[PDB]
Design a protein around this ligand. Structure first.
Ligand SMILES: *[C@@H]1O[C@H](CO)[C@@H](O)[C@H](O)[C@H]1O
Ligand SMILES: [K+]
Ligand SMILES: [K+]
Ligand SMILES: [Mg+2]
Ligand SMILES: [Mg+2]
Ligand SMILES: [Mg+2]
Ligand SMILES: [Mg+2]
Lengths: 317, 185, 82, 140, 104, 213, 140
RNA sequence: AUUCCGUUAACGAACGAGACCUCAGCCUGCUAACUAGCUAUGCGGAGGUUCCCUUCGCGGCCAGCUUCUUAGAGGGACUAC
């Protein structure tokens, strides 16, 4: 029942922190995106005045950067933007290596495959497209049974034997696709309002959907059944399962709430307190978390806020 | 405080002080308030009220030298004239020419006026505006149809005004303005 | 001045009447919603409608407004009194 | 460092190279040097007794910097405002005979030659001559 | 065998001009021909300014009349016969097509 | 060979002069406009008229005379220019046709008040958003005055006037002087682009009705 | 090839600075920047160097091309292109924190060092000789 | 701003205003240029110390590229905070 405390803050961005991506190698680098239309590569110096400093700033995009994901190697980053384009970033060279064109409206979510051999993106044009990272092929997932509104999140299932894509949408449905044939498998309908985030458990046996209604519905990916429901009480912006501690974190406008899944009780509620940050490590009344990401080892949690500040929460007392 | 910026790379802003409470916040000639290497900035100072109080006092003097019509917009000549005048001021007074310029502005600004006619007080900003206008009007008048150059006339006008001597054109006009104001109290 | 005309105010109220669930408190998200749920001929007109509707969403959060009829909100009030 | 034409002040260079052309004794000044003006836009003849060498040095420096300039181009380069009494000023060209004569002299000195596309072009000897003079100017 | 053929398009209507340019580039990409363009020349703005009044009475008001000419240049690397096939398609009204063998 | 600037101006002057020649030759045949479609090997001139049977003549005699005189006058190679008559699909939405329709009613003798309301009523029946007929001149008295007949929607200012307003001006040479006819028809938004402009009015905002699924 | 190309603008003047890894050369159209003309505006062009210091430019070579505008506006365009080129170079090839430091210095002194001035000439309207100025009005 | 909020024996509309259209201001993002250029490279000239450095000229539809130029499509401001 360990709680989390504020390790430090990182202050490079000057707008909403839309997404955060941590390395799979548990390195001292994280990559964040923001509405300032830039992506920042960080150097995590735990000791010092600031928990981390911006190493690089990549600014190729023409509009807001909505999502960012790192490859398994950790030397490349993939980002989506409201200009309707995906960019693969050579982090070492700080340049753009590949441009994926085809989405006719804002891209709201991107994800790498487990092998990093395929890329999937979501867009406001109501479509999901599959790409080849090094090839030129593209396969849009358009069918009679497809999302009828904005696709706000797409995630790959961490199961190699049965590849699966889970896509939320503003039509209040959470579809589950089978990548083998690119055909719909199941449709989940239990949300009163739009869904703006989905998550898949590290084992791949669970899902977590949230959005307008402020209700987290945990589904069973294999059978597409609603196991139970958690109540955040506020609009949910992102969900992430803890890598090691079998928790589920939700970024709500009120606060960041972590539920112990086995007990279904809130482990801790993390609320921004500028008074503490002013004296601990030292604009807008309404500041809330917009992005979450766990460290590879699960020791620290990174939160991106609407004020452009990244707060690091570490397990402890 | 200390700054590495030197006007014309010749004159130091260190030690320049504005010893007058009323007009201290409307004269930009100190090291802490945006020192400038040259009195030529393509600034946008008329966008808002009280915004030209941030313009450096040396550049405000330079602008008022672009008169009359024959001299409109010839700011390179105006910057040269003030550059030469400050060199002359240093020779005659053995003082920091920036300090002499602020003293001339402080002494030549009228502090009371008549309007409608009854006596009214003058705001610190208009007091600085009047001082600049009076100093450059006197230098321009003494240079016209005279062997003496405009830079020498400007230097003498500033040296006398900074000293408070009545020989200055701007000091006499300030006394005349404040003499009529007292008559209409 | 920056007074919104009847075109902007009238359209904003209609949007909030029948899409209150979709609308948010963010201008940038709201103007992407107006593209989906309305035909606004010009970009400048779309920005003003999105900005004023975002202003009206903040108004509704604190309490009720005059010209906007939100049925679900009305039903909540009726239950309270009864 | 090793200074060339571009590395020295144009005012200093023209003075040094003009004194170099006069000192060589290769330019043959025409009969009308002392009589003429440098264009109808002028009121008086040039004040400098060595104005011809100064003009020739200036024209050599411009051919060095840009090839293809003809006589008409030099008339514009040394033209300017003509005053018309009670009427407004307008641009006027300078003398073509002065430009043409100077170009024909620098060409016999082998400082310039005919550009194939038209106009005059600096030669290899011309480049050396101008560059050597610029190198001897004292740093100032 | 392969020659650089230049196609020049002129029009007062931008949308019609851009529509024909796309139809030619896309019509040549189908044949896998090398295409250079379209290159957009600076717009020519013919301008006639004239007195509004048919007489000389009143405030002297002026009408500024403008007739804009837009010009596009497309270079196709292929034989004249193939180019004649692509350009033979019906062209939108007011768009003037001009095919010439580039002198290179 | 002439430069692009002069060629485009020369093409505009040919269109303006051709329209004037047809406006007078085909005045009493409902002439409503012309389209000049210059193509390789042939320039096609399409004549729009409400009454095409009078523009073609008996067995196409008149349309051949117009083609012949046009080819000679404008230095066209023989058998390199064609004239084609065409009918106006909706005669009541063309201001040029209604202005000429009103013109011949006034010449015939029909009263101004009655003639102007016949045009005003016909235009609104044809599916127009509005109409306005103005007649000016010596109506009955020696002194001139203006009569304005308006009905429906109308706009005056801004860019939309160019797309939504169809206006025409004609002169009626009566026995006591000249009357001035002005017909101004406001069109209706036609997404297909046939009856009216396809682009909507700038201030018209349409909210899609929500779906319940 | 660690090079950047940043521009600066003032009215119709455009200066592009090509900043590459080097030894500290700074030249405008082939001429050392110490010979910038006019000489009294030379201070404005040197402000980025004076503010940051020559040691910041010791590892770069800046070659500047400038076109359009006039004598004063070209200096401001050059002045702006140098500051932008150095900032773009430090961000891309040195470090983010060093870019943060120098950009703060440039901004604290003058925001036009990095942000262009949007002012342009207002068009003339009939009924007068200027944009605003009207023809003199007489009644009798 | 007869612009709006409200008041209210008026209610609901029509014009003008606004919207709108053109030009200008931002885009190191998109499209792509031998009638626009840049960078690099090769060769050549000149200067300085054979490499190297500075500078200029010429060439390459197979150097590369689009920052600068051009002009299409879009984005951007809404008083958003
Ligand atoms: C007369 O009718 C034609 C039909 O094409 C129309 O284009 C004109 O505007 C109208 O006057
Ligand atoms: K000259
Ligand atoms: K060489
Ligand atoms: Mg209107
Ligand atoms: Mg208007
Ligand atoms: Mg560009
Ligand atoms: Mg635009």
């Amino acid at each position: 029942q360990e709680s989390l405390v504020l390790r430090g803050t990182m202050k490079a961005h000057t707008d909403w922190v839309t997404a955060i991506a941590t390395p799979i190698d548990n390195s001292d680098m994280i990559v964040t995106s923001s509405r300032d239309k830039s992506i920042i590569v960080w150097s995590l110096t735990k000791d010092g005045s600031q928990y981390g400093v911006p190493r690089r700033r990549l600014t190729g995009h023409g509009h807001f950067v909505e999502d960012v994901v790192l490859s398994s190697d950790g030397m490349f980053a993939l980002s989506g933007s409201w200009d309707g384009e995906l960019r693969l970033w050579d982090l070492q060279a700080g340049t753009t290596a590949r441009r994926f064109v085809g989405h006719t409206k804002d891209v709201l979510s991107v994800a790498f495959s487990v092998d990093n051999r395929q890329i999937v993106s979501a867009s406001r044009d109501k479509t999901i497209k599959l790409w080849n990272t090094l090839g030129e092929c593209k396969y849009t997932i358009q069918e009679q049974d497809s999302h009828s509104d904005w696709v706000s999140c797409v995630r790959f299932s961490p199961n190699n034997l049965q590849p699966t894509i889970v896509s939320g949408s503003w039509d209040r449905t959470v579809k589950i696709w089978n990548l083998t044939n690119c055909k719909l498998r199941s449709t989940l309908a239990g949300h009163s309002g739009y869904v703006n985030t989905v998550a898949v458990s590290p084992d791949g046996s669970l899902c977590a959907s949230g959005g307008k209604d402020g209700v987290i519905l945990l589904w069973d990916l294999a059978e597409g059944k609603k196991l139970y429901s958690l109540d955040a009480g506020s609009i949910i912006h992102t969900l992430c399962f803890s890598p090691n501690r079998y928790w589920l974190c939700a970024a709500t406008e009120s606060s960041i709430k972590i539920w112990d899944l086995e007990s279904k009780s809130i482990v801790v509620d993390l609320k921004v307190d500028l008074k503490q940050e002013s004296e601990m490590f030292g604009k807008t009344k309404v500041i809330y978390c917009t992005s979450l990401s766990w460290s590879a080892d699960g020791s620290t949690l990174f939160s991106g806020y609407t004020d452009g500040l990244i707060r690091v929460w570490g397990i402890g007392r | 405080p200390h700054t590495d910026v030197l006007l014309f790379n010749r004159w130091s802003y260190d030690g320049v002080q504005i010893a007058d409470m009323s007009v201290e916040d409307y004269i930009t000639a100190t090291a802490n308030k945006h020192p400038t290497y040259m009195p030529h900035t393509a600034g946008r100072y008329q966008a808002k009220r009280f915004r030209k109080a941030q313009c450096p006092i040396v550049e405000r003097l330079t602008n008022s030298l672009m008169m009359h019509g024959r001299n409109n917009g010839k700011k390179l000549m105006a910057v040269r004239i003030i550059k030469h005048a400050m060199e002359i001021i240093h020779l005659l007074t053995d003082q920091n020419p920036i300090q002499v310029i602020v003293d001339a502005v402080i002494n030549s600004g009228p502090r009371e006026d008549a309007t409608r006619r009854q006596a009214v007080d003058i705001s610190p900003l208009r007091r600085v505006n009047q001082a600049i206008y009076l100093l450059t009007t006197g230098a321009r008048e003494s240079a016209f149809r005279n062997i003496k150059t405009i830079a020498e006339c400007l230097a003498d006008e500033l040296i006398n005004a900074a000293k408070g001597s009545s020989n200055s054109y701007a000091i006499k006009k300030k006394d005349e303005i404040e003499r009529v104001a007292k008559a209409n109290r | 001045g920056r007074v919104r005309t009847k075109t902007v105010k009238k359209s904003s109220r209609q949007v909030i009447e029948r899409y209150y669930s979709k609308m948010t408190l963010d201008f940038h998200t709201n103007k992407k919603i107006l593209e989906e749920v309305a035909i606004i001929p010009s970009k400048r007109l779309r920005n003003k409608i999105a900005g004023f509707s975002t202003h009206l969403m903040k108004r509704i959060q604190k309490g009720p407004v005059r010209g906007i009829s939100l049925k679900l909100q009305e039903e909540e009030r009726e239950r309270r009194m009864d | 460092p090793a200074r060339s034409v571009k590395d020295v002040s144009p005012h200093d260079f023209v003075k040094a190279y003009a004194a170099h052309l006069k000192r060589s004794g290769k330019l043959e000044l025409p009969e009308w040097t002392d009589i003429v003006k440098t264009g109808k836009l002028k009121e008086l003849a040039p004040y400098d007794p060595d104005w011809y060498y100064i003009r020739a040095a200036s024209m050599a420096r411009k051919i060095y910097l840009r090839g293809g300039i003809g006589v008409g181009g030099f008339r514009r380069i040394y033209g300017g405002n003509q005053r018309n009494g009670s009427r407004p000023r307008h641009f006027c060209k300078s003398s073509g005979s002065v430009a043409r004569h100077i170009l024909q002299q620098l060409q016999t000195m082998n400082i310039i030659d005919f550009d194939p596309k038209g106009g005059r072009r600096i030669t290899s000897n011309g480049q050396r001559d101008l560059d050597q003079v610029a190198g001897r100017i004292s740093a100032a | 065998m392969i020659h650089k053929i230049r196609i020049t398009l002129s029009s007062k209507n931008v949308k019609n001009l851009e529509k024909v340019c796309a139809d030619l580039v896309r019509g040549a990409k189908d044949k896998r021909l090398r295409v250079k363009g379209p290159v957009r020349m600076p717009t020519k703005v013919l301008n006639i300014t004239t007195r509004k009044s048919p007489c000389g009475e009143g405030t002297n008001t002026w009408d500024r009349f403008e007739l804009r000419v837009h010009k596009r240049v497309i270079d196709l690397f292929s034989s004249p016969d193939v180019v004649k096939q692509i350009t033979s398609i019906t062209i939108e009204p007011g768009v003037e097509v001009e095919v010439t063998i580039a002198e290179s | 060979q002439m430069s692009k600037k002069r060629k485009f101006v020369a093409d505009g002057v040919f269109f303006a002069e051709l329209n004037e020649v047809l406006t007078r030759e085909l005045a009493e045949d409902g002439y409503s406009g012309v389209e000049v479609r210059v193509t390789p090997m042939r320039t096609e001139i399409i004549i729009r008229a409400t009454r095409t049977q009078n523009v073609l003549g008996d067995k196409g005699r008149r349309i051949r005379e117009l083609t012949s005189v046009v080819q000679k006058r404008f230095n066209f190679d023989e058998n390199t220019v064609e004239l084609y008559a065409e009918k106006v699909n909706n005669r009541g939405l063309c201001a040029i046709a209604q202005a000429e329709s009103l013109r011949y009613k006034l010449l015939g003798g029909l009263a101004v008040r009655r003639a102007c309301y016949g045009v005003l009523r016909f235009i609104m029946e044809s599916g127009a958003k509005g109409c306005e007929v103005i007649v000016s001149g010596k109506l009955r008295a020696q002194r001139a005055k203006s009569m304005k007949f308006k009905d429906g929607y109308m706009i005056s200012s801004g860019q939309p006037v160019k797309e939504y307003i169809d206006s025409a001006v004609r002169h009626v040479l009566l026995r006591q002087g000249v009357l001035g006819i002005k017909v101004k028809i406001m069109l209706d938004w036609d997404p297909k682009g046939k009856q009216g402009p396809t682009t909507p009015l700038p201030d018209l905002v349409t909210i899609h009705p929500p779906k319940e699924e | 090839v660690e090079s950047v190309q940043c521009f600066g603008r003032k009215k119709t003047a455009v200066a592009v600075t090509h900043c590459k890894r080097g030894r500290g050369l700074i030249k405008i159209n082939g001429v050392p920047i110490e010979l910038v003309q006019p000489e009294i505006l030379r201070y404005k062009a040197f402000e980025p160097i004076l503010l940051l210091g020559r040691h910041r430019f010791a590892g770069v070579d800046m070659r500047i091309r400038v076109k359009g505008g006039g004598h004063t506006s070209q200096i401001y365009a050059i002045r702006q292109s140098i500051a932008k080129a150095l900032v773009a170079f430090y961000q891309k090839y040195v470090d983010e924190q060093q870019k943060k430091e120098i950009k703060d210095i440039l901004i604290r002194y003058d925001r036009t060092l990095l942000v262009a001035d949007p002012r342009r000439c207002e068009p003339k309207k009939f009924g007068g000789r200027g944009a605003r100025s009207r023809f003199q009005k007489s009644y009798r």
